[PDB]
Amino acid sequence: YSSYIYKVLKQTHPDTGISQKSMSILNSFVNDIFERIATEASKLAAYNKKSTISAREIQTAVRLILPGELAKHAVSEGTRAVTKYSS
Amino acid sequence: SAKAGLTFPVGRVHRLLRRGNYAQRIGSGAPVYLTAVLEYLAAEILELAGNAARDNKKTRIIPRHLQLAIRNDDELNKLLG
Amino acid sequence: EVPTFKLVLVGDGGTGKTTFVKRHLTGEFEKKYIATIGVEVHPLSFYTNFGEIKFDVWDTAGLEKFGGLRDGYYINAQCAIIMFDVTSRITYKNVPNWHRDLVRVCENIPIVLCGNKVDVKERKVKAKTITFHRKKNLQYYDISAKSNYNFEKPFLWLARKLAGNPQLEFV
Amino acid sequence: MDINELIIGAQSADKHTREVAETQLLQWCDSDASQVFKALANVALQHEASLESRQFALLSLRKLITMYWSPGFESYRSTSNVEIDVKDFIREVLLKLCLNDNENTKIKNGASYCIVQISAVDFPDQWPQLLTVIYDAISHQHSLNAMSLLNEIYDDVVSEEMFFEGGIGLATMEIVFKVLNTETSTLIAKIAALKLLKACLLQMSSHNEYDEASRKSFVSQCLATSLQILGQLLTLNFGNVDVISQLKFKSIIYENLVFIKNDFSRKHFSSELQKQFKIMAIQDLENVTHINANVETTESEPLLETVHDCSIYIVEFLTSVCTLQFSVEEMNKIITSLTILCQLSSETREIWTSDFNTFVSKETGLAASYNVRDQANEFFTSLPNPQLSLIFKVVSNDIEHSTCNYSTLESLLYLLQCILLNDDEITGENIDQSLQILIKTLENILVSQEIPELILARAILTIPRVLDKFIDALPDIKPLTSAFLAKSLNLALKSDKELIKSATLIAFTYYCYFAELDSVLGPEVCSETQEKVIRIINQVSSDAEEDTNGALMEVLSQVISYNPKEPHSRKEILQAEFHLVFTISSEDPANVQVVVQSQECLEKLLDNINMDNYKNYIELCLPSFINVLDSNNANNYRYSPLLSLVLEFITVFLKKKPNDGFLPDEINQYLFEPLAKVLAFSTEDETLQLATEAFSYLIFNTDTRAMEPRLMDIMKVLERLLSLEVSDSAAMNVGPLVVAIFTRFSKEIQPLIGRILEAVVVRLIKTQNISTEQNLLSVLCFLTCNDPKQTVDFLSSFQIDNTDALTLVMRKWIEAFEVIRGEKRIKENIVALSNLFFLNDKRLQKVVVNGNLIPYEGDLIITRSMAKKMPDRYVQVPLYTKIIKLFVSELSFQSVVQLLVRFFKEVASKDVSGFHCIYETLSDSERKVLSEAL
Ligand SMILES: Nc1nc2c(ncn2[C@@H]2O[C@H](COP(=O)(O)OP(=O)(O)OP(=O)(O)O)[C@@H](O)[C@H]2O)c(=O)[nH]1
Numbered sequence A: 001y002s003s004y005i006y007k008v009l010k011q012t013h014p015d016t017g018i019s020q021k022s023m024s025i026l027n028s029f030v031n032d033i034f035e036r037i038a039t040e041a042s043k044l045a046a047y048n049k050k051s052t053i054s055a056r057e058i059q060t061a062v063r064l065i066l067p068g069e070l071a072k073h074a075v076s077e078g079t080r081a082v083t084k085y086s087s
Numbered sequence B: 001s002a003k004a005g006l007t008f009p010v011g012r013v014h015r016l017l018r019r020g021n022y023a024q025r026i027g028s029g030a031p032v033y034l035t036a037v038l039e040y041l042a043a044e045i046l047e048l049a050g051n052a053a054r055d056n057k058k059t060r061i062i063p064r065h066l067q068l069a070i071r072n073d074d075e076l077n078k079l080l081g
Numbered sequence C: 001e002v003p004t005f006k007l008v009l010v011g012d013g014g015t016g017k018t019t020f021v022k023r024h025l026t027g028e029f030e031k032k033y034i035a036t037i038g039v040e041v042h043p044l045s046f047y048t049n050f051g052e053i054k055f056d057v058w059d060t061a062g063l064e065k066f067g068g069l070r071d072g073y074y075i076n077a078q079c080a081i082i083m084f085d086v087t088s089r090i091t092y093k094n095v096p097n098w099h100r101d102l103v104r105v106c107e108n109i110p111i112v113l114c115g116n117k118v119d120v121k122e123r124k125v126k127a128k129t130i131t132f133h134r135k136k137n138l139q140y141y142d143i144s145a146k147s148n149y150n151f152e153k154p155f156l157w158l159a160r161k162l163a164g165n166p167q168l169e170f171v
Numbered sequence D: 001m002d003i004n005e006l007i008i009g010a011q012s013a014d015k016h017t018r019e020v021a022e023t024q025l026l027q028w029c030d031s032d033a034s035q036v037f038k039a040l041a042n043v044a045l046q047h048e049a050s051l052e053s054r055q056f057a058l059l060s061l062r063k064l065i066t067m068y069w070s071p072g073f074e075s076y077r078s079t080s081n082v083e084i085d086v087k088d089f090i091r092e093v094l095l096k097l098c099l100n101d102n103e104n105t106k107i108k109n110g111a112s113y114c115i116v117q118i119s120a121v122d123f124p125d126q127w128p129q130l131l132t133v134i135y136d137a138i139s140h141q142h143s144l145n146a147m148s149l150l151n152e153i154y155d156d157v158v159s160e161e162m163f164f165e166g167g168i169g170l171a172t173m174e175i176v177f178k179v180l181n182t183e184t185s186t187l188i189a190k191i192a193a194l195k196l197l198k199a200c201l202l203q204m205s206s207h208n209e210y211d212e213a214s215r216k217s218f219v220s221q222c223l224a225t226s227l228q229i230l231g232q233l234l235t236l237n238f239g240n241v242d243v244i245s246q247l248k249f250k251s252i253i254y255e256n257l258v259f260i261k262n263d264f265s266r267k268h269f270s271s272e273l274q275k276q277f278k279i280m281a282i283q284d285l286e287n288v289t290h291i292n293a294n295v296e297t298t299e300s301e302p303l304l305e306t307v308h309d310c311s312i313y314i315v316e317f318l319t320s321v322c323t324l325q326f327s328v329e330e331m332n333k334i335i336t337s338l339t340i341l342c343q344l345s346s347e348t349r350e351i352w353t354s355d356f357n358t359f360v361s362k363e364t365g366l367a368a369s370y371n372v373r374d375q376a377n378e379f380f381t382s383l384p385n386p387q388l389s390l391i392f393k394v395v396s397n398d399i400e401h402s403t404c405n406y407s408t409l410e411s412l413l414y415l416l417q418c419i420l421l422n423d424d425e426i427t428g429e430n431i432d433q434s435l436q437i438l439i440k441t442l443e444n445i446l447v448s449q450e451i452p453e454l455i456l457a458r459a460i461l462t463i464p465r466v467l468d469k470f471i472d473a474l475p476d477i478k479p480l481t482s483a484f485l486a487k488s489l490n491l492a493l494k495s496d497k498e499l500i501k502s503a504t505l506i507a508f509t510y511y512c513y514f515a516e517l518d519s520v521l522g523p524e525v526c527s528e529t530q531e532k533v534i535r536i537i538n539q540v541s542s543d544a545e546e547d548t549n550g551a552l553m554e555v556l557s558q559v560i561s562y563n564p565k566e567p568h569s570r571k572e573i574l575q576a577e578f579h580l581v582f583t584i585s586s587e588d589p590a591n592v593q594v595v596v597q598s599q600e601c602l603e604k605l606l607d608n609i610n611m612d613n614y615k616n617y618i619e620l621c622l623p624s625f626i627n628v629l630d631s632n633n634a635n636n637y638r639y640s641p642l643l644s645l646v647l648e649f650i651t652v653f654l655k656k657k658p659n660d661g662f663l664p665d666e667i668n669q670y671l672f673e674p675l676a677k678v679l680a681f682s683t684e685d686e687t688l689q690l691a692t693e694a695f696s697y698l699i700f701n702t703d704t705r706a707m708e709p710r711l712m713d714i715m716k717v718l719e720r721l722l723s724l725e726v727s728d729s730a731a732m733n734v735g736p737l738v739v740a741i742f743t744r745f746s747k748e749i750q751p752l753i754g755r756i757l758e759a760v761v762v763r764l765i766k767t768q769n770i771s772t773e774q775n776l777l778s779v780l781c782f783l784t785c786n787d788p789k790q791t792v793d794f795l796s797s798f799q800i801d802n803t804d805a806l807t808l809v810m811r812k813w814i815e816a817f818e819v820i821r822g823e824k825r826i827k828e829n830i831v832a833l834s835n836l837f838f839l840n841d842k843r844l845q846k847v848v849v850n851g852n853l854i855p856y857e858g859d860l861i862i863t864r865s866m867a868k869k870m871p872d873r874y875v876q877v878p879l880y881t882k883i884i885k886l887f888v889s890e891l892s893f894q895s896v897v898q899l900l901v902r903f904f905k906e907v908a909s910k911d912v913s914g915f916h917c918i919y920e921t922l923s924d925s926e927r928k929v930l931s932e933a934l
């Protein structure tokens, strides 16, 4: 998970400074989110009694975890990503 | 990731979620959705760190600017604890 | 002229120090968690007999990632409060480190140890797991922030010790 | 810039000056950190500088060490690296500052802290000179500062790898032993030396059978050597010179001894060595006790305290070796020494007599103090059965010969109490004769009127312990228990001292533990005992405290459990019991210990409620339950554990009832008005959440006709509950209440249907939380299932801001349809949607929604920073088409399936609203999925 974060870095910000510990702790935060999101997703799946995790599970999970405007931004970009990948 | 220029790959996240065995089967849209949401939240933090760096008046980035950015954002504080 | 005493507040991050001092300052219990950074000075006054007691609470950041030059704030401390969450044993395990640093910076100021968040239904650490304080002649006080259970008591004890007036009460 | 000017401004109270000074130094140190480090060490080295200024320099230096000293630190920064020459200069300064005796202890502690931080990475390979300098000072000069520095290093940076495999472990032990063996060394250095030994023993304490011959051989060799040296040290005597240091010297020696015994295998500590160590350990108690004669002069306050502190470790060692045999000659030595040590001090006696609240906390064990008296409890509790019989024989004999000695009688009684707390039974040759004498003198203590309060209180407390331990030895236990308990209660009533009254209440708790008072006393006698206890409780409760109230509930709980049965129930004691539990609890509502214990008391009293006595309980409880609501009303209903508890226990009162029908209007008349005022005029959500469900059950369990006049009143609560004044966390609780009110009052709610619909749609469209809006939409779909036409007409007629409300409510419904997780809520939502589709009103045809999302261009991630200028776009599609796509997508994902396919079949039966063309517009996969069901 290195080239991807460096490339998003160089596209969003043209001028920036970088040290290894910076995206070291960044990797940590994203890994925490992935684990958290794995927890909520799995629990709601068990709660709704579905052995298959699919879209509705992660829509529900993201909605319940992340609040505010970033939540609807996240679901918006996820939706455009899945439609641009389903076809 | 190379289908339409997506950044994060599908194999690494797929094997990471499979190692937890949270479900018997994985949906088709789950990997792409999680790659999308994860990269988005990561940028939400990188851009915040960047503006904190610009706030520091230094193009460089160190975790102190990240701490200032995360503390400034109340919703990000609630999300990240 | 009202005597003033410098008070430093330390504890593990997430234990409820800033909310406690804010409740003492105003009287409203804060809900959402905002991690304190650096140190904030909140003057405190108590209307008691035998004169007036004024406190200068030096709230300290409970997270090492925010406690820049944290050890350099107890230089002239006269009384300290070490408060720990009772919902997590990690705060109690970290308490000895806080006491060691406080003793190192200043030798023998009166220290009062407070167990916050007692209003919660269940506590992972009970009154039988406080072995550290009984061997260091410290004072254990059980307080809460959501309720006012013993919320004025530690300040009363510290004022009594500092003024040398065991018959001093708050009003 | 000046470093001296920076540090003085960096400790200023003002936030602005401190912030700029702190951020200037860190920024300055970020570039050319060598310049700052050299200057910072210079300030500390200067003697003329102020102590506060120097102390800050060292403490600031320690934090900067983790930042710029060298790589390997988690917080290390590569912006600037300290030069090797500067690194060596700091090392020389820190060692010099931490070794000279002319420096203040504040500087030495700060310097030692910096050295420890430096040693976290450099020690021991990168800094070989550190250990060599330290060893030279200890070996040749006995430098306490150097020795104390080694202790700090051992505590924080020394691990097993550098201890056993490295030479640190072997070198330190030899140096420590050398100091101890050398009698020419000063006494004070020996205390520090044994403190170093304790740190060394910590490394070996983690043995747990090391799988290493070298480690095992080294550990065993040192332990045997230390034990011989430790035994040798005890035999040496110093005299009367520096008595304080002698006590500390003995205290640290025994602290190590208990560490060896309790943290090592039995092979290292020989059993014969324990017998040898047990001899002078007992003799040390006599020496410590005889020291108190000099302490009686009160030359120094810590001298008395140091005697107790040193004696605690000595008693602790005897606890570890308590399994060893004790001779009769040394039997009296322990008891005689312990009586003096366990004697209550004048200050403690004065405090307990003046404030009985402190005594209750100590007696009940809730006190946070820990003295030699508590340690003596551990020693007697851990004794085995063969020694316990001899333990009891001498103590009982000593009590008989010390009846007239009130000075030391309290200690003997307390010692007897500790013995009886042991689990093992006490059997012996002449216990029966001894037991008869022991109770005879114990009885005379209560009869005598010249006994001091402290002795009388201890005798009252220790009486149940005697009976409990010897429940089988005594052949006349039943008459004895009644006589003693009645005597204890009578003394408490007559006595005017709260200390005795509180002691009797605690004593009554001990009686109920070992014996069932109902059987021994009898039916009528037990009732009299309950009446006597509550009278004692009433007098004590006037001057209670935070800990007294908690114990007062505990004894009250025992009285409740001894209530008579229904045929012989007495209304007088029930009224007193309920008024008492509320009185004490309301005095200290914030006390969580009181609240939870009062919960048990309330449950027991309400456990025997029937239909016949229901009316009596209504007037007994409800007026009291209203009072706390009025009491908390003046506080604007803030959080209170009592307030939460009473509201919760209000519900079970409604729950506990005959199942014939709804409860009588008396409960409704009493509780409705205070409950309604609670729901309004309150902003806290936790109390609101408990109140609404209590309010909901009262509505759902009351007569419709009786509740008819107040249908308007609850509407104000409904509007207030859905108003923006309250938090969204209390918003979802309106669901069950609205369901109950619709079930009970589906007839006359029609005039208020418009108002409640307006309130609920306003709250739904104004809220952002997922759970709150989900519960609100579930409520809305329930209303739609009740009457879809009226809801549609009202929504079309009603206007929000400048737009038709139905548009936004429909948009929110379709938006949150994909995100609902409640399976029952899913069924309600799906069924409601099917119903509205059936209605096929032209109003929904005109309006449009924006379910579909049109992707943007540029492949740029959009966040909140540029959301205003880069907003999302959605195409407009009819709601019928959107919902059709929703069900076909759900079936593609796919209980609700049977109902949904039944709805599909019903749709195919009439194909209204142009279902054929919409199905034609569907995708190939959607068409196949739809045809699968059809
Ligand atoms: N229910 C309850 N919450 C409490 C109590 N004490 C503290 N809190 C909560 O703990 C948090 C305190 O946050 P702060 O005021 O920043 O205090 P802190 O956690 O010591 O601060 P840092 O050390 O910077 O993390 C808030 O969420 C408080 O509501 C208590 O007795 N009861």
Ligand SMILES: [Mg+2]
Binding pocket: C014, C017, C018, C019, C034, C035, C036, C062
């Ligand atoms: Mg805080």
